[PDB]
Amino acid sequence: SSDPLVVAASIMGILHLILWILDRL
Amino acid sequence: SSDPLVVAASIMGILHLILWILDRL
Amino acid sequence: SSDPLVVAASIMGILHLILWILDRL
Amino acid sequence: SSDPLVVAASIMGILHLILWILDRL
Numbered sequence: 001s002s003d004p005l006v007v008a009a010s011i012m013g014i015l016h017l018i019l020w021i022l023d024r025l
Numbered sequence: 026s027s028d029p030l031v032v033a034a035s036i037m038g039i040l041h042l043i044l045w046i047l048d049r050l
Numbered sequence: 051s052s053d054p055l056v057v058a059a060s061i062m063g064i065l066h067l068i069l070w071i072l073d074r075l
Numbered sequence: 076s077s078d079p080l081v082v083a084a085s086i087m088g089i090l091h092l093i094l095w096i097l098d099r100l
């Protein structure tokens with residue numbers, strides 16, 4: 001499976017997209 | 026192999042690049 | 051080992067972040 | 076475990092987030 005550090009960076013990417021979308025709305 | 030979440034973040038990233046390329050063309 | 055989609059996105063992220071850093075200098 | 080390029084991209088993503096925060100400070 002993926003390294004915790006990689007998991008953490010992917011979560012950061014996903015949250016950033018969600019925050020950006022919420023801001024645009 | 027890779028965690029679902031990490032695969033999903035990668036697909037978002039690839040889509041992000043496609044969209045940017047399309048915008049610039 | 052990593053999913054091939056994850057390696058490909060990582061390589062794109064690296065190039066992107068490299069360009070970002072050069073500009074920030 | 077995760078490929079070296081995947082680990083590297085994740086670290087560079089974390090570096091970017093931190094440079095972005097410090098930039099605003």
Ligand SMILES: CCCCCCCCO[C@H]1O[C@@H](CO)[C@H](O)[C@H](O)[C@@H]1O
Nearest residue numbers: 011012013015016019020091092095
């Ligand atoms: C603690 C983990 C939360 C990470 C989510 C916040 C990431 C915000 O950081 C981002 O702000 C962007 C604005 O769209 C800028 O374009 C920057 O490139 C930066 O990466």
Ligand SMILES: CCCCCCCCO[C@H]1O[C@@H](CO)[C@H](O)[C@H](O)[C@@H]1O
Nearest residue numbers: 035038039041042045059062063066
């Ligand atoms: C998960 C990592 C995938 C990385 C995909 C890169 C997303 C491309 O998108 C970015 O392209 C840059 C130039 O290439 C532009 O300066 C913009 O910041 C754009 O958002």
Ligand SMILES: CCCCCCCCO[C@H]1O[C@@H](CO)[C@H](O)[C@H](O)[C@@H]1O
Nearest residue numbers: 076077078079080082083084086087
């Ligand atoms: C800019 C900072 C980037 C640092 C990148 C370090 C990533 C390497 O890290 C990798 O090294 C491998 C050696 O082949 C080990 O086998 C480990 O699996 C590890 O993932």
Ligand SMILES: [Cl-]
Nearest residue numbers: 002027052077
């Ligand atoms: Cl991985």
